[PDB]
A paper describes a structure:
GULO, ALO, and GalDH are generally named aldonolactone oxidoreductases and form a group of sequence-related flavoenzymes belonging to the vanillyl-alcohol oxidase family. They oxidize the C2 carbon atom of their monosaccharide substrates and thereby generate the characteristic, redox-reactive C2-C3 double bond of L-ascorbic acid and its analogs. GalDH is a dehydrogenase that reacts poorly with oxygen.
To elucidate the structural features of GalDH and how it interacts with its substrate, we determined the crystal structures of the viridiplantae ancestor without (1.9 Å resolution) and with L-galactono-1,4-lactone (2.1 Å resolution). Soaking in a substrate-containing solution led to the bleaching of the crystals and the resulting electron density clearly indicated the presence of the bound substrate. We, therefore, conclude that the crystals accumulate the substrate-bound reduced state, outlining the structure of the Michaelis complex. Upon substrate binding, the movement of a gating loop (residues 337-344) constricts the access to the active site, creating the catalytic cavity. L-galactono-1,4-lactone adopts a pro-catalytic conformation with its C2 carbon at 3.1 Å distance from the isoalloxazine ring and C2 hydrogen predicted to point towards the flavin N5 position. These interactions are enforced by the closure of the gating loop with two of its residues, Cys340 and Gln344, moving closer to the sugar to interact with its 1 and 5 oxygens. Arg388 and Lys456 critically position their positively charged side chains in contact with the substrate O2 atom, confirming previous hypotheses about the importance of Arg388 for enzyme activity.
Residue numbers in the entry: 10 to 243, 248 to 265, 281 to 506
Write the structure that this text describes.
Amino acid sequence: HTITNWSGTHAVRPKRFFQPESVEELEKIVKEAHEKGQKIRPVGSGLSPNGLAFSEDGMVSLALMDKVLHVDKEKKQVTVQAGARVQQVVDALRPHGLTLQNFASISEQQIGGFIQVGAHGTGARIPPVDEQVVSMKLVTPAKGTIELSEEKDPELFRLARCGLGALGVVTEVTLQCVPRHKLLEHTFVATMKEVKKNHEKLLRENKHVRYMWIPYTDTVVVVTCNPLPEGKKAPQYSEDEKLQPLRNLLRESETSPEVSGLSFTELRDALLAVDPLDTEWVKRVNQAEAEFWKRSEGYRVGWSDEILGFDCGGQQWVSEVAFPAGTLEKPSAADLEYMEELMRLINKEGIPAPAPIEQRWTAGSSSPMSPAYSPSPDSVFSWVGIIMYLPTEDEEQRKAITEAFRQYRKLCETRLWDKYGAAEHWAKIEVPEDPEELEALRERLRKRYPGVDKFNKARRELDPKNILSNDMIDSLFP
Ligand SMILES: Cc1cc2nc3c(=O)[nH]c(=O)nc-3n(C[C@H](O)[C@H](O)[C@H](O)COP(=O)(O)OP(=O)(O)OC[C@H]3O[C@@H](n4cnc5c(N)ncnc54)[C@H](O)[C@@H]3O)c2cc1C
Ligand SMILES: O=C1O[C@H]([C@@H](O)CO)[C@@H](O)[C@@H]1O
């Protein structure tokens, strides 16, 4: 049984692979692996871009433990087995009139894997998902099955719920839901100047805001979503006219066959496949994409779970950092300054950077390991995601792009992250081979994360034989 991540950038053939159907079966596996000193890294859907959950030695999946256990109608709360995919939870909650406060760009993540990395959506007043956990059960190699909440060892709770699978196997999570509700989604394009003008008010007056930045253009795609006051309503280009700049650029007879079945994101892939690391060509692809978005202005209505998802396109390298951008009441220009510099940087160095650079916002988290950890609840973090696509399975083309991206992320590390106090998404952080880079990263982590000594303390205590951790965890936290 091989496990491969979403983008096929990491795979693992674990010597031992468990898939219990019950807590009792899980408890027994962890007791025996404790006794025998055998590795058992928790794995959810295995999607993490950086293979965080992977172990050559042993992995345990709770995929078969995926029921909604309890819905507290009054407090709008759901208790669910960790192996439930976010999508299974949404479907289950449908009849009870509830949804999650936020969704990621996909919903194939297990609830366990979702909370253990502090995954997030967008909305300057909405925390990452780890802040939405009211309680959890956790099978530990030292103390068996323990229960954590604000009431029950609140300090361990806040450490554990965003634990990177290093503190125990989550079996059960209770989540603070909200009423199931429709969103009105408004997509429109702006210039940086137009973005700057309205930004401060836009974040604060719209429930969800997302900017898709298009390198080597002055097109920013703005997507706002707000609840629809019950029974409210809402140029207009065909699909063929929207896709026309991309089809014309690919065909370069008058027409296009086979191509016409390709979606917007499949066209971008086929276009980048042509000369992925040629900047002049990527400038041409990003311009064609800007034209597509300019022809895609308008409104959509759907349940929040349908609206808050995004087509992320083909296999890819991603890097996403969270950095402080003030609070609700004291705005910071840092989120827009970061993007100015990032665009200036990409031109300065001729980076063949495709679109989009995704920019989102979350409220702060009380979880000490959250990239958006803050002591103040009304802090605001901007998250900025850079991307390079792997549009084919040409092993040589994928190697060149892997290196291209390594240097792109490396230029953001050296020039921006320290300056802006940026922390890497736990599912997207890669471990340097160069020990100078590796020490540098550990130094960066001690800077971002003050409670790192408490995380290792909690590991010694709950996982003394260290069967829950892999080379990644040990290399990041020694
Ligand atoms: C296309 C795509 C889009 C994405 N969009 C977003 C996004 O919008 N926002 C965002 O924040 N993230 C996003 N991600 C990242 C994603 O949410 C995380 O990688 C998430 O951790 C994946 O869930 P999983 O079930 O695959 O977890 P895995 O990768 O399987 O595991 C993640 C972590 O959880 C631990 N773990 C898993 N199950 C358990 C358990 N039961 N008990 C204890 N520890 C456990 C693992 O050991 C590991 O540390 C995206 C990823 C992809 C590929
Ligand atoms: O990992 C991730 O990839 C998505 C990306 O493809 C956006 O262009 C992003 O939403 C998510 O965090």
